[PDB]
Amino acid sequence: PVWKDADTTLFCASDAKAYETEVHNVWATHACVPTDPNPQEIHLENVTENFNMWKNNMVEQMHEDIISLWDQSLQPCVKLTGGSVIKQACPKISFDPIPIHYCTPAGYVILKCNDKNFNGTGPCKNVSSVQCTHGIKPVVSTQLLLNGSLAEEEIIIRSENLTNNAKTIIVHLNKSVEINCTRPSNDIRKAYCEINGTKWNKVLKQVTEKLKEHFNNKTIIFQPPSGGDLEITMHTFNCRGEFFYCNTTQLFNNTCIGCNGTITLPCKIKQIINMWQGTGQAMYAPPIDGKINCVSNITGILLTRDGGANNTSNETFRPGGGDMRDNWRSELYKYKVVQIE
Ligand SMILES: C[C@@H]1CN(C(=O)N2C[C@H](CO)C[C@H](C(=O)Nc3ccc(Cl)c(F)c3)C2)C[C@H](C)N1C
Ligand SMILES: *[C@@H]1O[C@H](CO)[C@@H](O)[C@H](O)[C@H]1NC(C)=O
Ligand SMILES: *[C@@H]1O[C@H](CO)[C@@H](O)[C@H](O)[C@H]1NC(C)=O
Ligand SMILES: *[C@@H]1O[C@H](CO)[C@@H](O)[C@H](O)[C@H]1NC(C)=O
Ligand SMILES: *[C@@H]1O[C@H](CO)[C@@H](O)[C@H](O)[C@H]1NC(C)=O
Ligand SMILES: *[C@@H]1O[C@H](CO)[C@@H](O)[C@H](O)[C@H]1NC(C)=O
Ligand SMILES: *[C@@H]1O[C@H](CO)[C@@H](O)[C@H](O)[C@H]1NC(C)=O
Ligand SMILES: *[C@@H]1O[C@H](CO)[C@@H](O)[C@H](O)[C@H]1NC(C)=O
Ligand SMILES: *[C@@H]1O[C@H](CO)[C@@H](O)[C@H](O)[C@H]1NC(C)=O
Numbered sequence: 001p002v003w004k005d006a007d008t009t010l011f012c013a014s015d016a017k018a019y020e021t022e023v024h025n026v027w028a029t030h031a032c033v034p035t036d037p038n039p040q041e042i043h044l045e046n047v048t049e050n051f052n053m054w055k056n057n058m059v060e061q062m063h064e065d066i067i068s069l070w071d072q073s074l075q076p077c078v079k080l081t082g083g084s085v086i087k088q089a090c091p092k093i094s095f096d097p098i099p100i101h102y103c104t105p106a107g108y109v110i111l112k113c114n115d116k117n118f119n120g121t122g123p124c125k126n127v128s129s130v131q132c133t134h135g136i137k138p139v140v141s142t143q144l145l146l147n148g149s150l151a152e153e154e155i156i157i158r159s160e161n162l163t164n165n166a167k168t169i170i171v172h173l174n175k176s177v178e179i180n181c182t183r184p185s186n187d188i189r190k191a192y193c194e195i196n197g198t199k200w201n202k203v204l205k206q207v208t209e210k211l212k213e214h215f216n217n218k219t220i221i222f223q224p225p226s227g228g229d230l231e232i233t234m235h236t237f238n239c240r241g242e243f244f245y246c247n248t249t250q251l252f253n254n255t256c257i258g259c260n261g262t263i264t265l266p267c268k269i270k271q272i273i274n275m276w277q278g279t280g281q282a283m284y285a286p287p288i289d290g291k292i293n294c295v296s297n298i299t300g301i302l303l304t305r306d307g308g309a310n311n312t313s314n315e316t317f318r319p320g321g322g323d324m325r326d327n328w329r330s331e332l333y334k335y336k337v338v339q340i341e
C-alpha cells in the first residue's frame with residue numbers, strides 16, 4: 001500500500017494495426033506499445049481518494065500527444081503561424097480516431113474512480129488501481145463531445161466551479177444521440193448533419209432538469225454562442241480529414257421544451273482553419289470527391305453560462321469549446337496518477 005499524489009512521464013498503448021495507413025494507426029504504431037494483453041485492477045477495499053479532473057497532469061500529457069499526432073498527420077498546405085507562411089504539401093490522408101491508452105511506468109500507478117455518480121471533483125469511495133487507462137478516442141471537436149463514453153446512471157455535470165461563470169461546464173450524457181453528417185458528391189463545401197429531433201429534445205430536457213438542480217430551480221435558457229470565431233459559434237469537428245462547421249442554432253433555440261422530426265443542420269467544409277493546437281491559421285486543400293459521411297455519437301456537451309444573472313430568475317447557457325483539454329478531461333476524469341511511496 002501507501003502512495004502520494006505525483007506525476008511522471010506516461011506512455012501510451014493502442015491496437016494500431018500495422019500497414020494500415022490511417023494516420024492515428026501509424027502514429028500509435030511508432031509512438032505507442034501494444035496494449036496490455038492481460039490487465040487487472042486490484043480493487044482497494046474501504047478506501048477514499050480525492051480526484052480533480054480540472055487540475056490533472058494526465059490531460060496535459062494527452063494534449064501534447066494529440067498536438068504531436070495532428071502535427072505529423074494532417075499537414076496544412078500553408079501554415080500562418082506567428083506571422084510566418086511556412087508552406088507544405090497537403091496530401092489527402094486517411095483519418096479515423098483510434099482508442100489510445102495511457103499507462104504508468106514502473107514505480108507509479110493510476111487510480112480509477114468507480115463511483116457511478118462521480119462528477120470529477122473531490123472525494124470518491126469506490127477506488128481501484130490500474131496500470132493503464134482505457135481505450136480513449138482523441139476526438140477533436142467543439143460544442144459537442146462525440147464518440148466518447150456515457151455516464152453510467154444519471155446525467156453528471158462537471159465544472160471546476162459552478163458559481164464561476166468563466167469555468168467550463170461539461171455535461172456527461174447517460175445516453176447518446178446519433179449525429180449523421182454527409183457531404184454528397186457531384187458547392188463541394190456544402191454539407192449537412194441530421195439529428196433526430198425527438199431524441200435530442202428529450203435529453204436536452206433531462207439536461208435542463210439536471211441543470212435546474214444545480215441552480216436553485218432557476219429558469220434555464222439555452223441560447224447560441226455570443227459571437228466569436230466560427231470554431232466556437234458552430235459545432236466543429238474533423239470527418240475523414242475534412243473540417244466540418246455545422247450551425248447548431250436549431251438545437252439551443254428550437255426550445256421544443258408539432259416539433260419532433262429530423263433536424264437538419266447546415267454545414268460548410270472549411271479550408272482556412274483556426275487551429276486548436278495554438279498559434280494561428282491553417283489552409284487545407286478542397287475536400288475529396290465522393291460522399292463524405294460520418295455518423296457519430298453525441299456523448300457530451302461543452303456549456304458556458306452567462307454572467308450577470310445574479311439579480312434575475314434565469315440562467316442562460318451557450319455551447320462552448322476551443323480548449324481540447326476539456327475534451328480529454330471528459331474521459332480522463334476518473335483517472336489519476338499516484339506514485340507508490
Ligand atoms: C485552447 C486554445 C486554442 N487556441 C485558440 O486560439 N483558439 C481560437 C480559434 C478561433 O478563435 C478556435 C480554436 C479552436 O478550437 N479551433 C478548432 C480547429 C479545428 C477543430 Cl476540428 C476544432 F474542433 C477546433 C481555439 C490557442 C490557445 C493556445 N489555447 C489556449
Ligand atoms: C466498485 O466498482 C467495481 C468496478 O466494477 C465493482 O466491484 C462494483 O461496481 C463496486 N464494488 C462494490 C462493492 O460496490
Ligand atoms: C453509440 O452509442 C451506442 C449506444 O449508446 C453504442 O452501442 C455504440 O457502440 C456507440 N457507437 C460508437 C461508435 O461508440
Ligand atoms: C439519464 O439521467 C436522467 C437524469 O437527469 C434520468 O431522468 C434519465 O432517466 C436517465 N436516462 C438513462 C437512459 O439513463
Ligand atoms: C462534485 O461532488 C462533490 C462531492 O459529492 C461536491 O462537493 C461538489 O459540490 C460537486 N461539484 C459539482 C460541480 O457538482
Ligand atoms: C454573483 O456574482 C458574483 C460575481 O460577480 C459571483 O462571485 C457570485 O457567486 C454570484 N452570486 C451567486 C449566488 O452565485
Ligand atoms: C468559485 O467562484 C466564486 C465566484 O468568483 C469565487 O468567489 C470562489 O472563491 C470560487 N471557489 C474557489 C474554490 O475558488
Ligand atoms: C445518414 O445520412 C445519409 C444521407 O442522408 C443516409 O443515406 C444514411 O442512411 C444515414 N444513416 C443514418 C444511420 O442515419
Ligand atoms: C427544485 O424543484 C423541485 C420541484 O420538483 C423541488 O422538489 C426541489 O426541492 C427544488 N430544488 C431546490 C434546490 O430548491
Ligand SMILES: *[C@@H]1O[C@H](CO)[C@@H](O)[C@H](O)[C@H]1NC(C)=O
Pocket residue numbers: 233234247248249
Ligand atoms: C446559424 O443559422 C442561423 C439561422 O438559422 C443564423 O441566424 C446564424 O447567424 C447562424 N450562425 C452563424 C454563426 O452564422
Ligand SMILES: *[C@@H]1O[C@H](CO)[C@@H](O)[C@H](O)[C@H]1NC(C)=O
Pocket residue numbers: 224249253254
Ligand atoms: C434563434 O437564435 C437566433 C439568434 O442567434 C434568432 O435569430 C432566432 O430568433 C432564434 N430562434 C427562435 C425560435 O427564437
Ligand SMILES: *[C@@H]1O[C@H](CO)[C@@H](O)[C@H](O)[C@H]1NC(C)=O
Pocket residue numbers: 259260261
Ligand atoms: C411526434 O411524437 C409523437 C409522440 O409524442 C409521435 O406519435 C409522432 O409520430 C411524432 N411525430 C413524428 C412526425 O414523428
Ligand SMILES: *[C@@H]1O[C@H](CO)[C@@H](O)[C@H](O)[C@H]1NC(C)=O
Pocket residue numbers: 196197198199260261262
Ligand atoms: C427519434 O428517436 C425516438 C426514440 O427516442 C423514436 O421513437 C423516433 O421515431 C425518432 N424520430 C425520428 C424522426 O427518427
Ligand SMILES: *[C@@H]1O[C@H](CO)[C@@H](O)[C@H](O)[C@H]1NC(C)=O
Pocket residue numbers: 096097139146147237238239240293294295296297
Ligand atoms: C465516430 O466513430 C464512427 C465509427 O467509428 C466514425 O465513422 C466517425 O467518423 C467518428 N466521428 C468522428 C468525428 O471521428
Ligand SMILES: [Cl-]
Pocket residue numbers: 033034035036103
Ligand atoms: Cl504493457
Ligand SMILES: [Cl-]
Pocket residue numbers: 077078
Ligand atoms: Cl495553396
Ligand SMILES: [Cl-]
Pocket residue numbers: 221
Ligand atoms: Cl428567449
